[PDB]
Design a binder for these strands. Sequence first.
DNA 1: CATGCATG
DNA 2: CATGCATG
Lengths: 259, 257
Amino acid sequence: GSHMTWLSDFPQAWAETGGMGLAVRQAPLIIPLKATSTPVSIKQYPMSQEARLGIKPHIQRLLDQGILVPCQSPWNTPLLPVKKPGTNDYRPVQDLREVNKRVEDIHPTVPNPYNLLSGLPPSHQWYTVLDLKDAFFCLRLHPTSQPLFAFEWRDPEMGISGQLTWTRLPQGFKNSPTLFDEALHRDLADFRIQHPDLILLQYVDDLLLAATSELDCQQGTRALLQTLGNLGYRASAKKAQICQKQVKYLGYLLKEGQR
Amino acid sequence: HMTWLSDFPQAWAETGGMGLAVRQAPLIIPLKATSTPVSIKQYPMSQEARLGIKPHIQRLLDQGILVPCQSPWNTPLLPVKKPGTNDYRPVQDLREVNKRVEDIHPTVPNPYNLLSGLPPSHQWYTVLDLKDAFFCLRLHPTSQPLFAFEWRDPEMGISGQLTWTRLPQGFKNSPTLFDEALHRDLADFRIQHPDLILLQYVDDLLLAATSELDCQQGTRALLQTLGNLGYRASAKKAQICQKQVKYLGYLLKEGQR
DNA sequence: CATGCATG
DNA sequence: CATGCATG
């Protein structure tokens, strides 16, 4: 149709119009520690006022959304101000290595990008590719697990005088990809059943919907967006590839052939 | 009916846990322009009272509804009672805090004027009350300092104060902020169900339908919507699809009492 | 920045 | 054994 019509018919489905997501059907996650792990408090590396100002907006947006909350924890990991090469564009990166080492690994069951796409039958050649924005943040952390990802932050304006931590699955945590992948799979099982004429590929927060015609792809995408929104997820409108015979997915490019 | 608790896990507190209004962003509480922090010292309480209350504080702590803090503000924590031998419940005297917070217009219905506008045509009702309603709304970090109170406890690792991360009890504007929050959230539901009459008084709801079937279809949709929005109803108190129910202290069968 | 590992 | 760099 247009892209704008897609934005208009599904405001709750896109991160750009429906605010940040939160998976309503997902119970708070408990992060099991290794049998012998004990809290570790890695001190915050000194940070220049310039770098701090540079990442302040990132922290603020999260605080305003309740994604970051104040806490007092025996755990602590460094907050790193990563500045884009040749610019004054900063972004925060939390070094969670010491926490990851004390958390038990979860054998990732995420499918191989290649096989996933290699299964698509030649009968379904119309595609819609979406990627959920701030995916991990849509999954809540049980309060007993929140203390694990604490970091230092100071700002009188926000009434923060010590530490903050995440209420959602953090970026940088080793099991986030698989935990999210499994969550979205559970949440989309119903959709798959309601649409036997459609193929749905999903790799963590990346989705590819395949149909036999532009019409079926159109109607399937409407259903998918409505389902994702109701479920509490948010797709990136700016990056979406709706109803095309040629799309980019998981690094792979599929036109009527592959990459 | 046992299908209600099995079919709608997210809508009931028992199966869905502490709620959290997903459409409602953490709340900022505006202080009056003249206001200044108030520090009221904690009145010492019997070691027997600090026991019957200890569990509450602990439970909130563990759910993250309470958090340690250092704040310029401080209000009393009162050891209330009950007929029982050891039934002490927390009561925070937020009066000095309320006097310093900017007032907001009362938008809550008048109790009775709510039922007065109830068509005789709708005689099938469902009464639901939301559990821990105010707690579904979060407090922005910037406004959390306002509600702090003293609890030095070695056992849990508290060196001084604790404060709320959710809309607290005793805060003058809690009833109004929740009522307005729930009203906005259930608006789409009202529009999509014109043949249904929905009354809302803070955390007390009453759904009215023309027939038993309509009530059941309506109730299923309401619970589904509440769950998705993050609210939680008390399945234990719920009166589902029946012509005689009690709502807002009003007994209403086929003739209001 | 800190640094874990595949890599020669 | 030494080290480039992807990733926290």
